[PDB]
Amino acid sequence: GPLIVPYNLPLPGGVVPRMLITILGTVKPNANRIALDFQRGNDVAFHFNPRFNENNRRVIVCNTKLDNNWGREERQSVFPFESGKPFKIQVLVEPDHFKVAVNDAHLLQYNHRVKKLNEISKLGISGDIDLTSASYTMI
Ligand SMILES: CC(=O)N[C@H]1[C@H](O[C@H]2[C@@H](O)[C@@H](CO)O[C@@H](O[C@H]3[C@H](O)[C@@H](O)[C@@H](O)O[C@@H]3CO)[C@@H]2O)O[C@H](CO)[C@@H](O[C@@H]2O[C@H](CO)[C@H](O)[C@H](O)[C@H]2O)[C@@H]1O
Ligand SMILES: [Cl-]
Numbered sequence: 001g002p003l004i005v006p007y008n009l010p011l012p013g014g015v016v017p018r019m020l021i022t023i024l025g026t027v028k029p030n031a032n033r034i035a036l037d038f039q040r041g042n043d044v045a046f047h048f049n050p051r052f053n054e055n056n057r058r059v060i061v062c063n064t065k066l067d068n069n070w071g072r073e074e075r076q077s078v079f080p081f082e083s084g085k086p087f088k089i090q091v092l093v094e095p096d097h098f099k100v101a102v103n104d105a106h107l108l109q110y111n112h113r114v115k116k117l118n119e120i121s122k123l124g125i126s127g128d129i130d131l132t133s134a135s136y137t138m139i
């Protein structure tokens with residue numbers, strides 16, 4: 001059934017290459033933001049943040065937060081989300097990157113800045129979505 005947002009998905013023993021995380025939900029009408037935050041304690045190893053209205057443009061911001069400071073943003077203008085519509089986000093952990101696909105299309109890759117993959121042990125999901133499912137498997 002419905003999951004409550006913000007939602008915290010534990011990743012027992014951290015992430016590993018070949019782990020595939022799948023998030024299903026629906027963007028609310030008039031959404032502003034979505035965020036997936038892969039955490040290593042207080043640090044955010046990988047923040048994946050679609051913004052629906054940043055100076056009247058849609059953009060995806062990726063970043064990492066270390067010791068309560070945000071780093072250098074990486075931005076992607078390809079924006080596969082739409083207000084009101086169902087989505088699937090898949091994050092595949094690879095040896096050197098997270099790889100993100102939305103609705104079965106490749107979107108972006110994010111190079112690992114936090115290198116202790118085994119300590120990335122929680123995924124926070126938040127923002128203007130109805131969350132249907134969040135799960136992981138090994139491929
Ligand atoms: C104000 C806000 O949105 N705070 C949330 C925080 O947002 C920051 C994050 O998106 C970073 C990524 O680089 O950018 C920051 O904005 C930048 C901006 O992009 C730059 O152009 C320039 O202007 O500098 C600013 C400041 O660096 C955003 O402020 O993102 C975190 C993580 O998702 C949010 O935290 C969570 O909110 C959830 C809501 O339910 C939940 O509480 C969760 O537990 C929180 O960790 C901040 O709220
Ligand atoms: Cl953690």
Ligand SMILES: [Cl-]
Nearest residue numbers: 052081082083
């Ligand atoms: Cl939209």
Ligand SMILES: [Cl-]
Nearest residue numbers: 094095096097
């Ligand atoms: Cl890789």
Ligand SMILES: [Cl-]
Nearest residue numbers: 113114115116
């Ligand atoms: Cl590290």
